[PDB]
Design a protein around this nucleic acid. Structure first.
Ligand code: QBU
Ligand code: K
Ligand code: K
Length: 546
DNA sequence: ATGGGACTTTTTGA
DNA sequence: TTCAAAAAGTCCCA
């Protein structure tokens, strides 16, 4: 588990923290990487430091011990007092020690401050002027349970529930950064918007000044790695303004090596720059330009309801082993299953704007199987094919579920009604009215309108505005950006969407019903639908005053 | 190939 | 008892 940061980003991160260091005022800077690995960052730090000392060698010689400050002594001084590294992989440390040693190319026993340890457990004996690197990322599924108990116990300020391991590295880096120190790291971007990152965001904002955020959105920074990156630079300097530079990429299809340096890319048309006042950050960090902020605030102020106010949200079925319970609707095995047990089953791709595709799969709602003797053929010939994997689910091992039951079968009556469904990850808003009692896994979310809000909001009106170009832009302002052309559509944000009622209600709803009626007929022509959508977008923009 | 596009399971803490 | 979040996604092709 060793990952390579592209050289252009490494140089930017090191230059960011060291470009303005006053080596004459302080010729003993402590630069640390608690993830150093083989030394992607530290070896570049050595090069930057060596030039810095060499360019001012006579000034140091005059101001300080003139026998100590010579070009010949620069190498030894850097390793003794300046470069610090830590990594849990001793093979990586051994390689980095050879690399630092070979920078000069025994005389006398030069010591190198490299620690092979868990950086989250090391008793750090002092703080550091500059901290750079790329921490490990490990989510809640892939982190060992025994280790996770330690993080919950000792890193509770930033790590709880579905948090990530790199949250704790942010915590450690901030804690061991000197007063006036500067830190710069590349991490996943998700903590900027994710629900899990709320505590971490609060910790950063209240303990450091965030100088700069480079947000690569869905661009693929790490080749053959499914992750989305950002670069954060922060300091512990006494400043009275604390404004953040935000560099947000404009096109995710860029290759990172367009120029020789990352600065050229950031100042180019390929990025956009804007400023955010750190003191105006709430638990949410809404990092958008002034046009988007004006747009976002207009909608928030005009809308007196949220979806959570008026609707009941729920996540789909989690069977725990889909292959055991999900069959093609033309599978011959379904003749063994009484149709009282069978439900229509759709995937996220079956959701379009305003309507759902006809289902091609069936779910065996195995909870309603009374016992193991009356429906033996279903258990023996269909579900029992995966009995080993089924028995390994957590609730089966604890005895809460029978081996053939659905892990989280939810409540049938929630799905067997008129409701709205949307995919959990999509490039655009796709909210559909479900007329067919469709069930689904957790890749599709559903909601239905509360009974007391039915005389104010109809399903037809909701899919109308929710699928509009206005609401697509509006939702993406604060949505969690996952990968290229993919946003999370999860209730923790979808239910915070705000909605309105005014004089345009009837016409918006009527346009929605025409769209639905066209989308459902046989000789379907989408052309008029696009025109109707353009007209509805005009009404909505009129309604919200944008 | 390795870079790009289509599509999305069930484990898990609370 | 039972909710919903979580991409160092996953997998395939050219
Ligand atoms: O990938 C990023 C780089 O960072 C290094 N690293 C990874 N984790 C730590 C680290 N503490 C966290 C350790 C988490 C281990 C989780 C685990 C526990 C038990 C069994 C199994 C697992 N402390 C220092 N360096 C680290 C990698 O080696 C790598 O070079
Ligand atoms: K001197
Ligand atoms: K990406």
């Amino acid at each position: 588990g060793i990952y390579y940061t592209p050289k252009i980003i490494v140089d930017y991160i090191v230059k960011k923290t060291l470009k303005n260091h006053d080596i004459i005022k302080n010729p003993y800077p402590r630069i640390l990487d608690i993830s150093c690995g083989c030394g992607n960052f530290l070896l570049e730090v050595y090069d930057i430091l060596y030039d810095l000392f060499e360019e001012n060698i006579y000034e140091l010689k005059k101001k300080y011990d003139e026998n100590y400050w010579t070009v010949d002594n620069i190498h030894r001084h850097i390793l003794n007092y300046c470069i610090y590294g830590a990594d849990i992989d001793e093979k990586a440390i051994s390689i980095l020690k050879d690399s630092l040693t070979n920078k000069k190319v025994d005389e006398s026993d030069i010591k190198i401050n490299l620690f092979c340890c868990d950086s989250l457990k090391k008793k750090w004996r002092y703080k550091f002027d500059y901290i750079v690197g790329n921490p490990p990322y490990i989510g809640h599924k892939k982190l060992e349970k025994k280790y996770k108990k330690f993080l919950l116990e000792k890193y509770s300020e930033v790590y709880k529930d579905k948090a990530d391991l790199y949250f704790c590295f942010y915590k450690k880096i901030i804690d061991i950064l000197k007063q006036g120190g500067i830190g710069s790291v590349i991490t996943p971007r998700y903590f900027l918007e994710s629900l899990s990152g709320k505590d971490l965001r609060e910790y950063i904002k209240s303990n450091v000044n965030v100088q700069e955020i480079v947000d690569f959105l869905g661009a693929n920074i790490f080749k053959n790695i499914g992750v989305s990156s950002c670069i954060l630079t922060f300091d512990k300097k006494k400043t009275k303004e604390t404004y953040i530079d935000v560099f947000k990429i404009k096109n995710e299809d860029i290759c990172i090596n367009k120029f020789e340096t990352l600065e050229e890319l950031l100042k180019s048309s390929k990025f956009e720059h804007f400023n955010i006042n750190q003191r105006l950050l709430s638990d949410e960090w809404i990092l958008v330009n002034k046009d988007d902020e004006t747009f976002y605030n207009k909608i928030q102020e005009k809308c007196k309801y949220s979806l959570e106010d008026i609707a009941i949200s729920f996540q789909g079925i989690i069977t725990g082993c889909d292959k055991a319970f999900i069959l093609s609707k033309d599978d011959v095995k379904l003749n063994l299953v009484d149709d009282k047990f069978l439900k229509c089953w759709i995937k996220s791709k079956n959701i379009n704007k305003y309507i759902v595709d006809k289902s091609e799969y069936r779910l065996i709602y195995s909870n309603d199987i009374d016992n193991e003797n009356t429906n033996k053929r279903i258990l023996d010939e269909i579900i029992g094919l995966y009995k080993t994997k089924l028995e390994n689910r957590r609730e089966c091992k604890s005895g809460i579920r029978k081996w053939y039951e659905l892990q989280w079968g939810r409540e049938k009556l929630f799905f067997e009604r008129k409701k709205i469904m949307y995919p959990y990850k999509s490039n655009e808003n796709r909210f559909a009215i479900d007329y067919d009692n469709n069930f689904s896994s957790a890749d599709v979310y559903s909601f239905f309108i509360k009974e007391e809000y039915l005389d104010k909001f109809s399903y037809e009106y909701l899919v109308g505005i929710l699928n509009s170009s206005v609401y697509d832009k509006y939702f993406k302002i604060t949505a969690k950006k996952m990968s290229k052309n993919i946003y999370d559509y999860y209730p923790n944000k979808v239910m915070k969407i705000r909605i309105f009622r005014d004089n345009n209600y009837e016409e918006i709803e009527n346009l929605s019903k025409q769209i639905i009626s066209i989308l459902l007929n046989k000789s379907i022509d989408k052309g008029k639908v696009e025109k109707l959508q353009i007209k509805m977008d005009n009404l909505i923009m009129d309604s919200l005053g944008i």
